């Protein structure tokens, strides 16, 4: 689980990186090599943030510190630079995972295709990522979607094989989502208040 | 350029890894982020081979040595294991690049779509990779193809911006292809003679 936010809503960079570093692996709950490239993309963002943090953990103590430091370090190349860029993209992958899991927990489904997770992934994609992809990457997403597992399998993949009902799994996901969602929200507000959000497409 | 093969047709592992390590970058002659994941896939194979070589460069002096050593090291998990696996997949990416470049040099083109390289890429894909992909990855290839550059641009990307005619570029590619193709051929023969080739799909 992620720490709760402190009253000052500052997010400590070290603890944050340690928590998010447990996310990429999970993509192998999706159960197909198609998603391995995605894990490495997310993992790349986390690496890049850590490599900058590691250079001066004090200067880069909080996520806010990264943005404001890099803003003065880089001038006109900022925010399309350094850890600020990497975190700009990491927050979008995190949000995808948040929206996807929340949509599953909220019982959203396609009533005639109940064992799939395609509607949940698509919603997650539309809310987190689609705005930032050109059509080639969108078509790539559409194709990749088909590699997505059955809901039943996914959930069983989430519970480390450990024998809990689907209902119990979802209750634990809901618990995870509280501090996760609040953390992602704070990162998005920081990007807004720093005018560090860019809208270019890949 | 790659060294020529020696009379014994053994391929020294160190020099081979150094030569192929100059290939991934080029994928950024394709001129779009869609191909960055592919670079990292190929680069991953080269890393994995090097990490095994590095452990005992003498024991792993040649590519042949890697296969025969791993065969006795691993038993029934071989050849779907270690550097033998990584090289099994690396040779396929290398072959793709060989067939693609050769097809371009041979003047193969779609006469009504002359400025594209799609026929060349597809041929390269059918000859090197398609057999080893399931349909999701094939559809992903089809979508990605659209990110491929114009022939004119690609060629200009290959000549480090340096101002040589297209004809001169192709002549240099043809020269590159001689030892490259002969090297890849030798690797494929080794996999055959070692019964190390596997046909599973991703
Ligand atoms: C043979 C076949 C040929 C195969 C070719 C296949 C190519 C596939 C291409 C699509 C890969 C998806 C990744 C796309 C990424 O390009 C983008 C931007 O990525 C960022 O780009 C920045 C520069 O603009 C920096 O380089 C960042 O690098 S940095 O150095 O600043 O750190 C880098 O991550 N990230 C994204 O779109 C984020 C993706 C998050 C995904 C979240 C999970 C989604 C799961 C959905 C599954 C149902
Ligand atoms: C948001 C959107 C969502 C995005 C999701 C996109 C996902 C894209 C998936 C396709 C990526 C292409 C890579 C496929 C790879 O999966 C395969 C096998 O890869 C191997 O697998 C082995 C295990 O079976 C070992 O893990 C190898 O790992 S190891 O550790 O043994 O070293 C590993 O490379 N390699 C391949 O297919 C080889 C690919 C070579 C490509 C050659 C260049 C082609 C250029 C064509 C361009 C016109």
Author numbering:
A (entry chain A), B (entry chain A): 8 to 209
What does the paper say about this structure?
Human glycolipid transfer protein (hsGLTP) forms the prototypical GLTP fold and is characterized by a broad transfer selectivity for glycosphingolipids (GSLs). In human GLTP, a glycolipid headgroup recognition centre located on the protein surface enables selective binding of the GSL head and ceramide amide groups via multiple specific interactions. Encapsulation of lipid chains within the hydrophobic pocket involves a cleft-like gating mechanism that results in two glycolipid-binding modes. To elucidate the structural dynamics of the GLTP–GSL dimer and associated adaptations, we comparatively analyzed nine novel crystal structures of wild-type GLTP (wtGLTP) and the sulfatide-specific mutants D48V and A47D/D48V complexed with N-lauroyl-containing monosulfatide (N-lauroyl-3-O-sulfo-galactosylceramide; hereafter referred to as 12:0 monoSF) and disulfatide (N-lauroyl-3,6-di-O-sulfo-galactosylceramide; hereafter referred to as 12:0 diSF) in different crystal forms and compared them with previously studied GLTP–24:1 monoSF complexes.
Because the double mutation A47D/D48V restores the open dimer conformation along with the local negative charge repulsion in the dimer, we also studied the crystal structure of the double mutant A47D/D48V complexed with 12:0 monoSF. The mutations D48V and A47D/D48V, which reversibly regulate access of sphingosine to the hydrophobic pocket, mediate the regulation in the disulfatide (12:0 diSF) differently compared with the monosulfatide (12:0 monoSF) or in the short-acyl-chain sulfatide (12:0 monoSF) compared with the long-acyl-chain sulfatide (24:1 monoSF). Similarly, SF complexes with mutant D48V systematically deviate from those with wtGLTP or the double mutant A47D/D48V.
